A paper describes a structure:
The kinase RIP1, acting downstream of TNFR1 (tumor necrosis factor receptor 1), can trigger apoptosis through binding to FADD, the activating adaptor for caspase-8, or necroptosis through binding to RIP3. Although the kinase activity of RIP1 is dispensable for NF-κB and MAPK signaling by TNFR1, it is essential for interactions between RIP1 and RIP3 that activate RIP3 to phosphorylate MLKL. The kinase activity of RIP1 has been implicated in many pathologies characterized by inflammation and tissue damage. The kinase domain of RIP1 has unique structural features, which allow the development of selective RIP1 inhibitors.
To investigate the potential therapeutic benefit of inhibiting RIP1, we developed GNE684 or (S)-N-((S)-7-methoxy-1-methyl-2-oxo-2,3,4,5-tetrahydro-1H-pyrido[3,4-b]azepin-3-yl)-5-phenyl-6,7-dihydro-5H-pyrrolo[1,2-b]triazole-2-carboxamide with cross-species potency against RIP1, exquisite kinase selectivity, and favorable pharmacological properties. A co-crystal structure showed that GNE684 binds to the same hydrophobic pocket within the kinase domain of RIP1 that is bound by necrostatins. GNE684 binds to an inactive conformation of RIP1, similar to type II kinase inhibitors, with the Asp156 and Leu157 of the DLG motif (commonly DFG in other kinases) in the “out” conformation and the αC helix swung away from the ATP-binding cleft, and lacking the canonical ion pair between the catalytic lysine (Lys45) and αC glutamate (Glu63). GNE684 inhibited human RIP1 potently in vitro, and mouse and rat RIP1 with slightly less potency. Accordingly, it inhibited TNF-induced necroptosis in human HT-29, mouse L929, or rat H9c2 cells. Accordingly, GNE684 disrupted TBZ-induced RIP1 autophosphorylation, interactions between RIP1 and RIP3, RIP3 autophosphorylation, and phosphorylation of MLKL by RIP3. Consistent with observations in cells expressing kinase-dead RIP1 mutant D138N, GNE684 did not affect RIP1 protein abundance or TNF-induced activation of NF-κB or MAPK (JNK) signaling, even at elevated concentrations (20 and 200 μM). However, interspecies differences in RIP1 mean that inhibitors blocking human RIP1 can be over a hundred-fold weaker against murine RIP1. Although slightly more potent against human RIP1, GNE684 can also inhibit mouse RIP1 effectively. GNE684 provided much the same level of protection as genetic inactivation of RIP1 in several inflammatory disease models (TNF-driven SIRS, colitis induced by NEMO deficiency in IECs, and collagen antibody-induced arthritis).
Author numbering: 8 to 19, 30 to 175, 188 to 294
């Protein structure tokens, strides 16, 4: 359940926050300025609906702060940051854990798709990791928070394409689908084993967009550490140019869970 929390609930732009009674949380204040009270109940219900997406692999929206001219969202604190932070830490992550993170991403995405939620911005920054290396899927760019996103863009307030299905590059009139997210997943799979972002040799945005739409993909030979052949096959399957040929997350799960259990766990 969501709390209509108050600024007063916290000790004296994104920022750490210590709730006076509940503890560490993440706050994004989305808006400062004129009153716009007419938006209040829609902002609250939208937060309620996002808060109703509950699953072990989906991040919890803990509270909102709705005040005279200050609107803030409050999220649970994931101790190890996002997945790229984890992949780029000095201490390595063993193959078993990488396999589990993949399985858990599949579960969160199957759950979301089960509820009719198309993420549209899946990427390592939206995959958060707790102290025990379990993951939760987040929506930090507010791609599913329609009203808060508009609130964030209002005039009187005070981006990466690596993971975008090629159908959406240079085409803002295509509607994203579940297969859009599957493509993103494919590139996340590559990042997990490369321990870095793809396309490091790309020079210009227009060169990248045109290259990916012509069929360029992340360089599989650039994976130095060991990567199971089945996982190389999965990412190639998941980033096929034809969206209708990419599998669903339930189809992915039925393949990868028995492979995870028998080979990587
Ligand atoms: C650093 O930038 C950000 C951006 C934000 C935040 C922290 N750092 N805070 C404080 C949040 O609360 C974020 N919330 C989410 O991303 C969020 N909340 C939920 N989800 N994501 C879940 C979800 C996941 C995927 C799709 C839809 C909903 C349901 C609850 C959105 C705004």
């Amino acid at each position: 359940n969501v709390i209509k929390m108050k600024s007063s609930d916290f000790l004296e732009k994104v920022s750490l926050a210590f709730h006076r009674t509940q503890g560490l949380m993440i706050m994004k204040t989305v808006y400062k300025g004129p009153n716009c009270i007419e938006h209040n109940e829609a902002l609250l219900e939208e937060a309620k609906m996002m808060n109703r997406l509950r699953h072990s692999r989906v991040v919890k929206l803990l509270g909102v702060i709705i005040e005279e001219g200050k609107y803030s969202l409050v999220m649970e604190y994931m101790e190890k940051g996002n997945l790229m932070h984890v992949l780029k830490a000095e201490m390595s992550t063993p193959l078993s854990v990488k396999g589990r993170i993949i399985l858990e991403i599949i579960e969160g995405m199957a759950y979301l798709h089960g509820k009719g939620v198309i993420h549209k911005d899946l990427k390592p920054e939206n995959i958060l990791v707790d102290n025990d290396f379990h993951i939760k899927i987040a929506d930090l760019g507010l791609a599913s928070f329609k009203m808060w996103s508009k609130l964030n863009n209002e005039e009187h307030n005070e981006g990466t394409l690596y993971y975008m299905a090629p159908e959406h590059l240079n085409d803002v009139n295509a509607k994203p689908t579940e297969k859009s997210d599957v493509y993103s997943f494919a590139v996340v799979l590559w990042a997990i084993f490369a321990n870095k972002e793809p396309y490091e040799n790309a020079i210009a945005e227009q060169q990248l967009i045109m290259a990916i739409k012509s069929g360029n993909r992340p360089d599989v030979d650039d994976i130095t550490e060991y990567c199971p052949r089945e996982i190389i096959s999965l990412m190639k399957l998941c980033w096929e140019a034809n969206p209708e040929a990419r599998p669903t997350f339930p189809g992915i799960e039925e393949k990868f869970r028995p492979f995870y259990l028998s080979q990587l766990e």
